[PDB]
Amino acid sequence: SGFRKMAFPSGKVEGCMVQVTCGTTTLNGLWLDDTVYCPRHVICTAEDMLNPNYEDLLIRKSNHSFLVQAGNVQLRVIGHSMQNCLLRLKVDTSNPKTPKYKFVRIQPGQTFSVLACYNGSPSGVYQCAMRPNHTIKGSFLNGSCGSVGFNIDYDCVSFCYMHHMELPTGVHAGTDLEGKFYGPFVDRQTAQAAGTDTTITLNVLAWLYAAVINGDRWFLNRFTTTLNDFNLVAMKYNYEPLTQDHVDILGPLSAQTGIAVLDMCAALKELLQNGMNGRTILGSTILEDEFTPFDVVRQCSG
């Protein structure tokens, strides 16, 4: 079947992207039904960015302080309110392209699709994973903000991310669609830093199973390991501790390939200790961790 890092088709999300301006700041907003969601920092100026008091900044705005545009058409704002780090603007007209959707706060290690936008227009779509330290290793330029992360299950779009900033290390942070930041960050230009990050062990194993269902078994061995002994080694390599739930999650893939979870762990263990000796797995030269077990069983043949 082959193996690609694919994103969900982005069309359902494209039809919700609008432009939102306040003062001289413009960024992206998400338009669903009669509401537009966007990062509350759209209300700041250049001097507000260091110690903004959003509450104080917002009370000084009216509905006509917000300019929302769908393409070249202006959408009138008839209401506004702040929810955590987002602004909820009510508009007098409804988005007919609004898909079935829900707001979900994903878990670290979980994957999602991002539709990077600039001035309310789609630029590109890529798939990534919420890092264990809550940051995203994305690709955002200035004016990206407002862009969203999402997953699609059938015809229902699950929105899980909205962009707000870049951390000194070049990685990115944001919130769920309720405005709550993912990670210990705040939306202000202050010295902030991501916590230590780890490789998502659950995903590497899902991926190794991807290589196997795909006909590749070179990295397997005749050993086995206990959960404890596997973790004692994996932790040495900065890998997320593997739990019994994680092993269960791998149950389906396990039964599909005939390789016990602990035996696959034994294989991973060896790979960590001896490198790949120049070989590749699914074309890759390093252990890949942005594929959840779910992504694996979805992209690969049952």
Binding site: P39, H41, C44, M49, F140, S144, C145, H163, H164, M165, E166, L167, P168, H172, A173, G174, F185, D187, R188, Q189, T190, A191, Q192, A193
Partner: peptide
């Protein structure tokens, strides 16, 4: 250190 997007 942090940049608002």
């Amino acid at each position: 250190x942090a940049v608002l997007x």
